[PDB]
Subunit: 114 residues, 3 copies
């Protein structure tokens, strides 16, 4: 799986250990090994959410399966929880787009997962 956070929070506000925490918790949440989890955090962005520029996050989570109604609500509770606790971003200023990828449309190691 792959998780990306884009935020206007400054780099210095991203605490040490954040990428590893995301890796571990997404491994636990998706049931997939931490070796297959990729994470990417992009601070200092020029962004607005609802017309204002208080801390906000625009995120995506791509996974081959493990995407669905109940699971996505659980992921959202998890990820908003981490973004509030670690980056001080209110959960109501976070969007997370979820993508159920087909294995044939994910490239890795010179091939795909098909």
């Amino acid at each position: 799986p792959m998780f990306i956070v884009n935020t206007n929070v400054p780099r210095a506000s991203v605490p040490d250990g954040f990428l590893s925490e995301l890796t571990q918790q997404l491994a636990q949440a998706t049931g997939k090994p931490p070796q297959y989890i990729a994470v990417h955090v992009v601070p200092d962005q020029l962004m607005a959410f609802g017309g204002s520029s208080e801390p906000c996050a625009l995120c995506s989570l791509h996974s081959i399966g493990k995407i669905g109604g109940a699971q996505n609500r659980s992921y959202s509770k998890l990820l908003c929880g981490l973004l509030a606790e670690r980056l001080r971003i209110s959960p109501d200023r976070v969007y997370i787009n979820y993508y159920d990828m087909n294995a044939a449309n994910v490239g890795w190691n010179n091939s795909t997962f098909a």
Copy 2:
């Protein structure tokens, strides 16, 4: 809805007021309240279009519904118009990818929009 613009245009060429203007213009174009509109602008990017490093933009619009043939032609006119006028980007050097998101696959405030 969520609008993201990635561009090689420099940061100082992004007019003050651009995020607010995109917000308001999108709220009106999509029929959704400005409070649900998120906008993100990423200047100074290493990018090319058609092999050329002349000014260009790669963008995305995600919305839960309000995405389709007619609407997307109208959004494309609106957004290219804005990019030409405010960032001096020629419409023919702009890609905008539209995504009609299912509400179950958009996380917000510890849950999803489902």
Copy 3:
């Protein structure tokens, strides 16, 4: 087509001509004219792959058609080869998400391709 690479490799290790090589190679691989091909490289990112911060890349390729099982395998071989060769990223630390876009959902030059 549109190809984006996000990577933790520094700006300096991206070699001159990289964007142009990506454009020409994608022209051929996709059988699409190079004048329509957009490429974007984002270095110096804060990312991890399998919990490790060794060189990695998260990428996407979008296209109206020409996306499928065998084609995506051949794109991944090509693209992973380029990232290994030019940025010294191990193919097994690369993900490439492929998106087959509907012509109605791609905006260009004040309209769409529907």
